[PDB]
């Protein structure tokens, strides 16, 4: 079956830029063109919510 549902690399590449900037979706987001803002901060401070 396909993984999609938020690639292993797209994690990374937020977890790099975010350790870096902080919850600066605004920027990531330019990053990741497809992955808006609102996406990306939900899916963080959802899945993702290791703020370290």
Do not use: C, F
């Amino acid at each position: 079956v396909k993984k999609t549902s938020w690639t292993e690399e797209e994690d990374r590449i937020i977890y790099q830029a975010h350790k870096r900037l902080g919850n600066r979706w605004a920027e990531i987001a330019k990053l990741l063109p497809g992955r808006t803002d609102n996406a990306i901060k939900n899916h963080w401070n959802s899945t993702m919510r290791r703020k370290v």
